[PDB]
Amino acid sequence: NPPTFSPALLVVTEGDNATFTCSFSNTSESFVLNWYRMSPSNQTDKLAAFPESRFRVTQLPNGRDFHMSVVRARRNDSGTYLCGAISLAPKAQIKESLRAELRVTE
């Protein structure tokens, strides 16, 4: 039951804010939700978490949605992003959204 991460493509002018939404409803006994950017290789580099910079994760009033927000977006922030729900109990599991791409222009 993978999370969703939208919009799947997002163009913004540098200095503006950039807001994805990660939606994940899960019945997991113990879990965390992480925001990843892909490295210049395909390595998952953690940017932030719910719970636990300009990379801010915020649960919304309806509860199943979260804003992953890049504040005051730089140009070389441009790249690939995703949210990864990690269940810790009873069964450890990693669930990833499809990858979204962020373009920041001059």
Binding site: V32, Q43, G84, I86
Partner: protein
């Protein structure tokens, strides 16, 4: 920030040998076991599920029961080291490690089996 790291992303391993691949995680003074979870998987098969110092064999993909293990004496050093014996062609691919220990992260490792 709890982050996991890998020494290298890609390992070349000889067919028919034993391999070890690793993910590193920060550890303070001593290891709190009860606060530690370690998971390895490959291609959605579950290899290691180590939860507070106990392998849960129930949830392990049964073809690894005997050939896979986490090096227990490396954990206090901040090293999650998965070791698989008798590496074959099928063991090539992308492995994922997740460690949870105030709180969580994961990484991917490519294994290339040279034969």
């Amino acid at each position: 920030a709890f982050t996991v790291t890998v020494p290298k992303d890609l390992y070349v391993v000889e067919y028919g040998s034993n391999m070890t691949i690793e993910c590193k995680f920060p550890v303070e003074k001593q290891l709190d076991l009860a606060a530690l979870i370690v998971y390895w998987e490959m291609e959605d098969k579950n290899i290691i599920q180590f939860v507070h110092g106990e392998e849960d064999l129930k949830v392990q993909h049964s073809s690894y029961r005997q050939r896979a293990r986490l090096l227990k004496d490396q954990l206090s050093l901040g090293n999650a080291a998965l070791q698989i014996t008798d590496v074959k062609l099928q063991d090539a691919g992308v492995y994922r490690c997740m460690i949870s220990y105030g709180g969580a992260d994961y990484k991917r490792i490519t294994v290339k089996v040279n034969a």
